[PDB]
Amino acid sequence: MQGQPHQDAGMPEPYAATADVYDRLVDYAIAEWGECPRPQMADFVEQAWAARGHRVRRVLELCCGTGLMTEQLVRRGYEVTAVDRSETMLALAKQRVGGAADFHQIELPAPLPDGADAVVCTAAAFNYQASARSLGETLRAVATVLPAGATFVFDIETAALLKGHWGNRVWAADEGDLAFIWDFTSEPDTTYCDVHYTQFTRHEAGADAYTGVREVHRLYAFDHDTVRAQARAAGFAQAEVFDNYTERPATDTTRYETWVLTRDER
Amino acid sequence: MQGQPHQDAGMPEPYAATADVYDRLVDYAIAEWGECPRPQMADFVEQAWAARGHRVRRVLELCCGTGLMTEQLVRRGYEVTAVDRSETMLALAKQRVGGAADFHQIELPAPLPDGADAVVCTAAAFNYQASARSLGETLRAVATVLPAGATFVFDIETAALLKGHWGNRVWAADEGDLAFIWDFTSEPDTTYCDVHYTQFTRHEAGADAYTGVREVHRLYAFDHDTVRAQARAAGFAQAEVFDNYTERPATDTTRYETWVLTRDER
Numbered sequence A, B: 001m002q003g004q005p006h007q008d009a010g011m012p013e014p015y016a017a018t019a020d021v022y023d024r025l026v027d028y029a030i031a032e033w034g035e036c037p038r039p040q041m042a043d044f045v046e047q048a049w050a051a052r053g054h055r056v057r058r059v060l061e062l063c064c065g066t067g068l069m070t071e072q073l074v075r076r077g078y079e080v081t082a083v084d085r086s087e088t089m090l091a092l093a094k095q096r097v098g099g100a101a102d103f104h105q106i107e108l109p110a111p112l113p114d115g116a117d118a119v120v121c122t123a124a125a126f127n128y129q130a131s132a133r134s135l136g137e138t139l140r141a142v143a144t145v146l147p148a149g150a151t152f153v154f155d156i157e158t159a160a161l162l163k164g165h166w167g168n169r170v171w172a173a174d175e176g177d178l179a180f181i182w183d184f185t186s187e188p189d190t191t192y193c194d195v196h197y198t199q200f201t202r203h204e205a206g207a208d209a210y211t212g213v214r215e216v217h218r219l220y221a222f223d224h225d226t227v228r229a230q231a232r233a234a235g236f237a238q239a240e241v242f243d244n245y246t247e248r249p250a251t252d253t254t255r256y257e258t259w260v261l262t263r264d265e266r
């Protein structure tokens, strides 16, 4: 996976070993750090479409993961195409949604399936973009399949958090059947934070045996000037930034920034 | 163990399951949180004795643990008596020091061996005292064996930390062969913090099997007025408080307070 630490043989790529705990860790993130529940994310994007008079029918979802946002869009009656680089994540998305969405294994940046009325990318997937250059190339791929005036909504963890909050701190929990640790490290003059994730899964209740699994996730911070510059060059001169899928403009307490990009029109 | 959470059958008392990782966790605490290395603790207590003209020969050490402070005192030529409630901790202290100190298994408060010229209690052992009442009873036991003008030096984690720092936060580390989590919880109107400690010990390098162990430690906060009141009632009207085994008076950044109590004289 481009942009992730070079590591030994048999070391998992992000989500290659942890896909089967992802939904549980999302429930934890919602309860602990303020990650937005998917129904609210879907309410927000629908409100954004309605406020522009967009008769959105076809939605392209990037980095769909296990399909938590995909299922909201499918339930609401959209014709959903959903893409992700991870075969383990996609297998869970297919279990959740079945044939009600069209799934593709694609590593961004790469050409995207044509025909959408709107594009979404939820839950900080864009923090895996390896560079401002790659981010711009991914935004170009989106612009290619969106008509003038159409919208792309995505969220990222705010740049300071990957350097000054989580920054170099540690979080963990012991839930008995599973214990997990996130150890964040960010070197002085880099734009990224390495998250060393470790988990221990109990073999059986009432016994003390566990299996340990580790994954390293490199997360890149993008400041507002970089997002705006790459968006403009990609064909989204208009970009706005909100606080975590609410209509409140982003402020200094925002942890998850929701960017609403509008495709250039005439 | 009085003052510790009532828990199920087969749940370890403090240090009953973790004595064999204690020295390693002290090395971690020294590196991570600023716990004072034992040679410096010993330098500080010796400087305090010299500043009073005390020809200290016999030292009583309370809550000696695995003997890290005991070994400093023995090396420096003192005649050391050392006591602790924990058979697992004392077995490690005897491995370290052998017959060069006189060890007793005693749970404080209780009568102490007579004859000391000075008493010490290092590394926050007094935060296990179950109440201000118990603390006072332990101080009385010390006063009983100390002559007029003699000193008792002990340290405690500062009251605010057990309510406002560690307070309700989490710390953890994954070191490969051992991973550990401290999960601190402190209810609104209590004077104590429960530390849920969990560790996972690797069976062998190059394999993913671990064994999990948990211990719960209830730590009590004592404010300055309480320490001073119980010390006075016990026969130590003079009490002074320093920052972590330096000659600097305690301040608002002090995490480990070093109390120097002087036995009443005429």
Ligand SMILES: Nc1ncnc2c1ncn2[C@@H]1O[C@H](CSCC[C@H](N)C(=O)O)[C@@H](O)[C@H]1O
Pocket: A014, A015, A026, A062, A063, A064, A065, A066, A067, A068, A069, A083, A084, A085, A086, A089, A106, A107, A108, A109, A121, A122, A123, A124, A125, A128, A129
């Ligand atoms: N360059 C890239 N191309 C495609 N998928 C990517 C990617 N970088 C990261 N991902 C995917 O981004 C996801 C991040 S987790 C977010 C999942 C989902 N959007 C949700 O709302 O829960 C993972 O499934 C990961 O495999």
Ligand SMILES: Nc1ncnc2c1ncn2[C@@H]1O[C@H](CSCC[C@H](N)C(=O)O)[C@@H](O)[C@H]1O
Pocket: B014, B015, B026, B062, B063, B064, B065, B066, B067, B068, B069, B083, B084, B085, B086, B089, B106, B107, B108, B109, B121, B122, B123, B124, B125, B128, B129
């Ligand atoms: N009431 C009590 N009576 C005796 N020992 C006690 C006690 N409460 C706690 N302890 C002991 O206090 C120790 C705390 S760890 C500190 C060990 C040592 N003084 C050092 O400098 O490293 C443990 O060994 C524990 O068993």
